PDB file of C-alpha atoms in Angstrom:
ATOM      1  CA  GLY A   1     130.904  64.649 141.507  1.00 37.75           C
ATOM      2  CA  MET A   2     128.320  67.412 141.256  1.00 35.51           C
ATOM      3  CA  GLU A   3     130.697  69.800 139.491  1.00 36.52           C
ATOM      4  CA  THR A   4     131.321  67.341 136.619  1.00 32.54           C
ATOM      5  CA  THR A   5     127.614  66.523 136.255  1.00 31.52           C
ATOM      6  CA  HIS A   6     126.657  70.229 136.063  1.00 32.27           C
ATOM      7  CA  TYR A   7     129.471  70.754 133.537  1.00 30.11           C
ATOM      8  CA  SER A   8     128.140  67.960 131.322  1.00 30.48           C
ATOM      9  CA  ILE A   9     124.518  69.102 131.509  1.00 31.30           C
ATOM     10  CA  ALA A  10     125.452  72.674 130.575  1.00 30.34           C
ATOM     11  CA  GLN A  11     127.711  71.547 127.749  1.00 31.16           C
ATOM     12  CA  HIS A  12     124.921  69.461 126.226  1.00 31.12           C
ATOM     13  CA  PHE A  13     122.263  72.165 126.489  1.00 32.75           C
ATOM     14  CA  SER A  14     124.532  74.954 125.196  1.00 31.87           C
ATOM     15  CA  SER A  15     125.620  72.874 122.199  1.00 31.82           C
ATOM     16  CA  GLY A  16     121.913  72.302 121.266  1.00 31.40           C
ATOM     17  CA  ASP A  17     121.608  68.718 122.406  1.00 28.67           C
ATOM     18  CA  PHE A  18     118.574  69.502 124.512  1.00 25.44           C
ATOM     19  CA  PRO A  19     117.110  65.936 124.632  1.00 23.49           C
ATOM     20  CA  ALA A  20     120.206  64.711 126.535  1.00 23.67           C
ATOM     21  CA  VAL A  21     119.219  66.880 129.510  1.00 21.42           C
ATOM     22  CA  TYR A  22     115.399  67.020 129.620  1.00 20.08           C
ATOM     23  CA  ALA A  23     115.525  64.506 132.522  1.00 22.78           C
ATOM     24  CA  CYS A  24     117.648  67.089 134.440  1.00 25.38           C
ATOM     25  CA  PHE A  25     115.064  69.882 134.157  1.00 22.23           C
ATOM     26  CA  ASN A  26     113.496  71.096 137.361  1.00 23.65           C
ATOM     27  CA  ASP A  27     109.679  70.792 137.381  1.00 23.43           C
ATOM     28  CA  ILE A  28     109.503  74.633 137.345  1.00 24.11           C
ATOM     29  CA  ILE A  29     112.506  75.330 135.147  1.00 26.20           C
ATOM     30  CA  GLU A  30     112.529  78.680 133.396  1.00 28.81           C
ATOM     31  CA  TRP A  31     114.409  79.537 130.187  1.00 29.98           C
ATOM     32  CA  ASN A  32     114.861  83.305 129.871  1.00 29.43           C
ATOM     33  CA  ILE A  33     115.960  84.043 126.271  1.00 31.77           C
ATOM     34  CA  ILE A  34     117.014  87.678 126.778  1.00 34.40           C
ATOM     35  CA  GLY A  35     115.174  90.124 124.512  1.00 32.19           C
ATOM     36  CA  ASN A  36     112.810  87.376 123.361  1.00 31.59           C
ATOM     37  CA  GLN A  37     110.819  85.571 126.049  1.00 32.99           C
ATOM     38  CA  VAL A  38     110.658  83.504 129.221  1.00 29.33           C
ATOM     39  CA  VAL A  39     109.471  79.863 128.800  1.00 28.03           C
ATOM     40  CA  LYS A  40     108.245  78.384 132.106  1.00 31.32           C
ATOM     41  CA  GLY A  41     107.680  74.887 133.435  1.00 32.78           C
ATOM     42  CA  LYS A  42     109.115  71.536 132.484  1.00 34.37           C
ATOM     43  CA  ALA A  43     106.533  70.674 129.795  1.00 32.62           C
ATOM     44  CA  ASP A  44     106.610  74.090 128.125  1.00 31.16           C
ATOM     45  CA  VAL A  45     110.449  74.247 128.096  1.00 33.28           C
ATOM     46  CA  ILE A  46     110.719  70.716 126.668  1.00 34.69           C
ATOM     47  CA  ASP A  47     108.112  71.504 124.001  1.00 36.59           C
ATOM     48  CA  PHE A  48     109.935  74.728 123.097  1.00 34.99           C
ATOM     49  CA  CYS A  49     113.266  72.950 122.892  1.00 36.51           C
ATOM     50  CA  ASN A  50     111.724  70.227 120.706  1.00 39.20           C
ATOM     51  CA  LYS A  51     110.272  72.834 118.313  1.00 40.42           C
ATOM     52  CA  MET A  52     113.845  74.384 118.095  1.00 39.70           C
ATOM     53  CA  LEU A  53     115.769  71.083 117.799  1.00 42.57           C
ATOM     54  CA  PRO A  54     115.785  70.780 113.984  1.00 41.79           C
ATOM     55  CA  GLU A  55     117.378  74.260 113.737  1.00 41.68           C
ATOM     56  CA  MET A  56     120.088  73.128 116.153  1.00 39.71           C
ATOM     57  CA  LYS A  57     120.647  69.888 114.208  1.00 39.70           C
ATOM     58  CA  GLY A  58     121.244  71.896 111.017  1.00 43.06           C
ATOM     59  CA  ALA A  59     123.618  74.343 112.707  1.00 42.80           C
ATOM     60  CA  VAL A  60     127.164  73.940 114.128  1.00 41.97           C
ATOM     61  CA  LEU A  61     127.553  74.919 117.791  1.00 44.40           C
ATOM     62  CA  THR A  62     130.899  75.326 119.567  1.00 43.88           C
ATOM     63  CA  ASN A  63     131.207  75.986 123.287  1.00 42.09           C
ATOM     64  CA  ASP A  64     134.291  78.273 123.752  1.00 40.20           C
ATOM     65  CA  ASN A  65     134.619  79.132 127.502  1.00 41.51           C
ATOM     66  CA  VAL A  66     133.198  78.074 130.908  1.00 42.31           C
ATOM     67  CA  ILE A  67     132.856  79.754 134.292  1.00 45.60           C
ATOM     68  CA  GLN A  68     131.737  77.503 137.093  1.00 46.90           C
ATOM     69  CA  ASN A  69     131.064  77.940 140.830  1.00 44.27           C
ATOM     70  CA  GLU A  70     129.423  75.236 143.034  1.00 41.98           C
ATOM     71  CA  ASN A  71     125.852  76.236 141.972  1.00 40.47           C
ATOM     72  CA  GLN A  72     125.800  78.316 138.759  1.00 41.77           C
ATOM     73  CA  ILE A  73     127.688  77.809 135.475  1.00 41.90           C
ATOM     74  CA  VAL A  74     128.240  80.126 132.432  1.00 43.49           C
ATOM     75  CA  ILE A  75     129.083  78.872 128.918  1.00 41.24           C
ATOM     76  CA  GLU A  76     130.089  81.127 126.040  1.00 41.14           C
ATOM     77  CA  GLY A  77     130.010  79.845 122.515  1.00 40.16           C
ATOM     78  CA  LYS A  78     129.018  80.333 118.907  1.00 39.91           C
ATOM     79  CA  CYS A  79     126.325  78.921 116.652  1.00 39.41           C
ATOM     80  CA  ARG A  80     127.082  78.773 112.904  1.00 40.69           C
ATOM     81  CA  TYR A  81     123.998  78.787 110.705  1.00 40.94           C
ATOM     82  CA  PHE A  82     122.951  80.031 107.248  1.00 38.89           C
ATOM     83  CA  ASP A  83     121.092  83.476 106.686  1.00 39.25           C
ATOM     84  CA  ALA A  84     118.426  84.578 104.121  1.00 41.77           C
ATOM     85  CA  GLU A  85     120.927  84.884 101.303  1.00 42.97           C
ATOM     86  CA  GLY A  86     121.819  81.281 102.268  1.00 40.15           C
ATOM     87  CA  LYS A  87     125.043  82.723 103.618  1.00 41.55           C
ATOM     88  CA  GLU A  88     127.028  81.753 106.674  1.00 44.37           C
ATOM     89  CA  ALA A  89     126.188  83.649 109.844  1.00 42.94           C
ATOM     90  CA  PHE A  90     127.154  83.301 113.514  1.00 42.69           C
ATOM     91  CA  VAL A  91     125.215  83.883 116.737  1.00 40.89           C
ATOM     92  CA  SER A  92     127.446  84.465 119.767  1.00 42.74           C
ATOM     93  CA  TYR A  93     125.846  83.123 122.943  1.00 41.74           C
ATOM     94  CA  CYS A  94     126.293  83.261 126.667  1.00 41.06           C
ATOM     95  CA  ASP A  95     124.186  80.698 128.606  1.00 39.03           C
ATOM     96  CA  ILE A  96     123.877  80.989 132.386  1.00 41.49           C
ATOM     97  CA  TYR A  97     122.623  77.988 134.393  1.00 40.30           C
ATOM     98  CA  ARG A  98     121.427  77.996 137.958  1.00 39.18           C
ATOM     99  CA  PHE A  99     121.134  74.576 139.406  1.00 38.77           C
ATOM    100  CA  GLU A 100     119.087  73.318 142.342  1.00 35.59           C
ATOM    101  CA  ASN A 101     121.308  70.413 143.315  1.00 35.60           C
ATOM    102  CA  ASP A 102     121.248  68.164 140.166  1.00 30.87           C
ATOM    103  CA  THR A 103     118.308  69.859 138.392  1.00 32.37           C
ATOM    104  CA  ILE A 104     118.432  72.893 136.092  1.00 33.93           C
ATOM    105  CA  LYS A 105     116.407  75.560 137.839  1.00 34.20           C
ATOM    106  CA  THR A 106     116.971  78.426 135.401  1.00 35.33           C
ATOM    107  CA  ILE A 107     118.691  79.023 132.077  1.00 36.18           C
ATOM    108  CA  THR A 108     119.360  82.621 130.900  1.00 33.90           C
ATOM    109  CA  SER A 109     120.624  83.026 127.311  1.00 30.30           C
ATOM    110  CA  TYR A 110     122.149  86.125 125.699  1.00 32.25           C
ATOM    111  CA  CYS A 111     122.278  85.565 121.934  1.00 33.95           C
ATOM    112  CA  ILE A 112     123.736  88.100 119.515  1.00 34.21           C
TER     113      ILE A 112
ATOM    114  CA  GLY B   1     140.368  89.667 150.263  1.00 32.30           C
ATOM    115  CA  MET B   2     140.759  89.128 146.530  1.00 28.43           C
ATOM    116  CA  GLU B   3     137.161  87.977 146.080  1.00 26.10           C
ATOM    117  CA  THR B   4     135.749  91.235 147.520  1.00 27.81           C
ATOM    118  CA  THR B   5     138.127  93.400 145.471  1.00 30.48           C
ATOM    119  CA  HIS B   6     137.183  91.622 142.210  1.00 30.19           C
ATOM    120  CA  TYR B   7     133.503  91.974 143.164  1.00 28.51           C
ATOM    121  CA  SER B   8     133.887  95.728 143.659  1.00 32.38           C
ATOM    122  CA  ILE B   9     135.842  96.276 140.444  1.00 32.54           C
ATOM    123  CA  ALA B  10     133.262  94.373 138.389  1.00 27.71           C
ATOM    124  CA  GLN B  11     130.353  96.159 140.034  1.00 26.56           C
ATOM    125  CA  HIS B  12     131.851  99.554 139.210  1.00 25.09           C
ATOM    126  CA  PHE B  13     132.660  98.725 135.591  1.00 27.38           C
ATOM    127  CA  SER B  14     129.300  97.042 134.902  1.00 28.46           C
ATOM    128  CA  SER B  15     127.368  99.977 136.367  1.00 32.65           C
ATOM    129  CA  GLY B  16     129.265 102.385 134.012  1.00 33.90           C
ATOM    130  CA  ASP B  17     131.597 103.914 136.553  1.00 35.25           C
ATOM    131  CA  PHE B  18     134.630 103.131 134.445  1.00 36.28           C
ATOM    132  CA  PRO B  19     136.983 105.795 135.940  1.00 31.85           C
ATOM    133  CA  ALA B  20     136.814 104.053 139.352  1.00 33.49           C
ATOM    134  CA  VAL B  21     138.634 101.040 137.889  1.00 33.91           C
ATOM    135  CA  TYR B  22     141.042 102.332 135.214  1.00 30.59           C
ATOM    136  CA  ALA B  23     143.899 101.821 137.730  1.00 30.70           C
ATOM    137  CA  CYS B  24     142.897  98.102 137.850  1.00 31.60           C
ATOM    138  CA  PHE B  25     143.255  97.565 134.089  1.00 30.44           C
ATOM    139  CA  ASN B  26     145.958  95.202 132.945  1.00 26.90           C
ATOM    140  CA  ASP B  27     148.470  96.828 130.556  1.00 23.98           C
ATOM    141  CA  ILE B  28     147.094  94.561 127.772  1.00 23.31           C
ATOM    142  CA  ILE B  29     143.454  94.510 128.814  1.00 22.27           C
ATOM    143  CA  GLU B  30     140.970  93.654 126.095  1.00 22.89           C
ATOM    144  CA  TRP B  31     137.281  94.631 126.020  1.00 21.61           C
ATOM    145  CA  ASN B  32     135.349  92.363 123.648  1.00 26.19           C
ATOM    146  CA  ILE B  33     131.926  93.981 123.027  1.00 26.39           C
ATOM    147  CA  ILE B  34     130.230  90.998 121.355  1.00 24.87           C
ATOM    148  CA  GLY B  35     128.902  91.763 117.868  1.00 25.92           C
ATOM    149  CA  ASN B  36     130.640  95.145 117.881  1.00 26.31           C
ATOM    150  CA  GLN B  37     134.404  95.153 118.412  1.00 25.05           C
ATOM    151  CA  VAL B  38     137.455  94.291 120.488  1.00 27.39           C
ATOM    152  CA  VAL B  39     139.295  97.270 122.096  1.00 26.37           C
ATOM    153  CA  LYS B  40     142.878  96.360 123.071  1.00 26.49           C
ATOM    154  CA  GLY B  41     145.469  97.803 125.420  1.00 28.38           C
ATOM    155  CA  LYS B  42     145.199  99.972 128.488  1.00 27.69           C
ATOM    156  CA  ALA B  43     145.306 103.343 126.683  1.00 29.89           C
ATOM    157  CA  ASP B  44     142.819 102.371 123.975  1.00 30.51           C
ATOM    158  CA  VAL B  45     140.341 100.833 126.478  1.00 28.42           C
ATOM    159  CA  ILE B  46     140.544 103.886 128.762  1.00 31.20           C
ATOM    160  CA  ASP B  47     140.053 106.237 125.803  1.00 32.06           C
ATOM    161  CA  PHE B  48     137.071 104.189 124.602  1.00 33.01           C
ATOM    162  CA  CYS B  49     135.528 104.155 128.054  1.00 33.22           C
ATOM    163  CA  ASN B  50     136.036 107.925 128.363  1.00 34.35           C
ATOM    164  CA  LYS B  51     134.319 108.531 125.000  1.00 34.49           C
ATOM    165  CA  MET B  52     131.348 106.370 126.314  1.00 34.03           C
ATOM    166  CA  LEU B  53     131.202 107.870 129.837  1.00 33.96           C
ATOM    167  CA  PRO B  54     128.705 110.687 129.147  1.00 35.06           C
ATOM    168  CA  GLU B  55     126.217 108.114 127.769  1.00 33.18           C
ATOM    169  CA  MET B  56     126.603 106.107 130.976  1.00 33.97           C
ATOM    170  CA  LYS B  57     126.161 109.229 133.133  1.00 32.87           C
ATOM    171  CA  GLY B  58     122.847 109.975 131.391  1.00 34.32           C
ATOM    172  CA  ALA B  59     121.586 106.400 131.721  1.00 33.16           C
ATOM    173  CA  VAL B  60     120.494 104.315 134.757  1.00 33.25           C
ATOM    174  CA  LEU B  61     122.377 101.033 135.219  1.00 32.48           C
ATOM    175  CA  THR B  62     121.344  98.282 137.643  1.00 32.64           C
ATOM    176  CA  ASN B  63     123.437  95.187 138.285  1.00 33.68           C
ATOM    177  CA  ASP B  64     120.958  92.288 138.918  1.00 30.23           C
ATOM    178  CA  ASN B  65     122.983  89.042 139.442  1.00 26.84           C
ATOM    179  CA  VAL B  66     126.596  87.878 140.017  1.00 26.72           C
ATOM    180  CA  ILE B  67     128.478  84.637 139.430  1.00 28.75           C
ATOM    181  CA  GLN B  68     131.944  84.509 140.891  1.00 28.01           C
ATOM    182  CA  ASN B  69     134.746  81.912 141.022  1.00 28.54           C
ATOM    183  CA  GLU B  70     138.304  82.674 142.298  1.00 30.38           C
ATOM    184  CA  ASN B  71     139.429  84.154 138.917  1.00 31.48           C
ATOM    185  CA  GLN B  72     136.478  85.118 136.678  1.00 31.83           C
ATOM    186  CA  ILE B  73     133.253  86.980 137.532  1.00 30.80           C
ATOM    187  CA  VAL B  74     129.951  87.452 135.581  1.00 32.79           C
ATOM    188  CA  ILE B  75     127.505  90.330 136.184  1.00 33.64           C
ATOM    189  CA  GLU B  76     124.055  90.552 134.625  1.00 32.78           C
ATOM    190  CA  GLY B  77     122.189  93.807 134.616  1.00 31.16           C
ATOM    191  CA  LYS B  78     120.162  96.380 132.742  1.00 31.26           C
ATOM    192  CA  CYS B  79     120.843  99.831 131.343  1.00 32.64           C
ATOM    193  CA  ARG B  80     117.871 102.224 131.068  1.00 31.51           C
ATOM    194  CA  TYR B  81     118.292 104.910 128.431  1.00 31.04           C
ATOM    195  CA  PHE B  82     116.114 106.936 126.032  1.00 31.40           C
ATOM    196  CA  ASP B  83     115.580 105.917 122.248  1.00 32.08           C
ATOM    197  CA  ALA B  84     115.077 108.028 119.056  1.00 36.10           C
ATOM    198  CA  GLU B  85     111.476 108.836 119.877  1.00 35.60           C
ATOM    199  CA  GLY B  86     112.949 110.042 123.207  1.00 33.27           C
ATOM    200  CA  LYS B  87     111.308 106.996 124.731  1.00 32.71           C
ATOM    201  CA  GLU B  88     112.522 104.723 127.485  1.00 35.27           C
ATOM    202  CA  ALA B  89     114.485 101.687 126.357  1.00 32.97           C
ATOM    203  CA  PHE B  90     116.518  98.995 128.132  1.00 30.67           C
ATOM    204  CA  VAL B  91     119.705  97.147 127.176  1.00 30.54           C
ATOM    205  CA  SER B  92     120.157  93.846 129.018  1.00 29.16           C
ATOM    206  CA  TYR B  93     123.833  93.084 129.612  1.00 26.60           C
ATOM    207  CA  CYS B  94     126.041  90.254 130.710  1.00 26.05           C
ATOM    208  CA  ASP B  95     129.656  91.290 131.508  1.00 22.13           C
ATOM    209  CA  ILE B  96     132.316  88.614 131.997  1.00 22.78           C
ATOM    210  CA  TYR B  97     135.610  89.547 133.696  1.00 22.12           C
ATOM    211  CA  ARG B  98     138.785  87.533 133.725  1.00 24.66           C
ATOM    212  CA  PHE B  99     141.258  88.744 136.235  1.00 23.53           C
ATOM    213  CA  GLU B 100     145.017  88.265 136.410  1.00 26.97           C
ATOM    214  CA  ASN B 101     145.400  88.531 140.165  1.00 26.88           C
ATOM    215  CA  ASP B 102     144.145  92.112 140.928  1.00 24.85           C
ATOM    216  CA  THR B 103     144.126  93.416 137.328  1.00 19.77           C
ATOM    217  CA  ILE B 104     141.325  93.097 134.765  1.00 20.74           C
ATOM    218  CA  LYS B 105     142.766  91.022 131.957  1.00 24.00           C
ATOM    219  CA  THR B 106     139.660  90.733 129.779  1.00 25.63           C
ATOM    220  CA  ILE B 107     136.091  92.010 129.746  1.00 25.07           C
ATOM    221  CA  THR B 108     133.501  90.360 127.434  1.00 24.62           C
ATOM    222  CA  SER B 109     130.110  92.111 127.160  1.00 24.01           C
ATOM    223  CA  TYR B 110     126.878  90.742 125.673  1.00 26.49           C
ATOM    224  CA  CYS B 111     124.443  93.640 125.250  1.00 21.82           C
ATOM    225  CA  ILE B 112     120.918  93.200 123.915  1.00 24.25           C
TER     226      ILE B 112
END
């Protein structure tokens, strides 16, 4: 049902596998990366995700926790990557999805 | 009912009015301030909140959005405060509460 589809979409996006869910983007999707920027519209969000994709492919992302209602879903997780000293580092993230039926209407990401 | 009580508790904590909800803390409550620290146990979390309270009283906190299931609740908001130049600044927060019936079991805060 809808709950399982939302769950899957969110899991894929949060873990960096953006291309698996581009077809689920609303035409006017917004991605609000808190403290950074808001990317708006299907084409601009897909292009931004594609620019970012190699960084995700080189990193290791683990989704840790999920909070789901009928409409909105929240995923916490961590992204392991390597810093300037070429040393291991971790970004802790919280991604919040608002769906409009089976499309992603908004994504809000807190990344620390 | 339970949903409205959880909602109220979370609203008060997220807006910095910690003393209104100390009586709702679980004995082994944990507050995980992402990228900072984990404060553990009722007494230590209350003491930490009390140390922080004057900073909250001098700031202006606005809860913007809420995602609630039967158990866990997520509040997004912003805290307006003044920086080193004595200039206005804003921390964007996402607070995630896990309840154990009517007690707060865990709080996880992402603050940017």
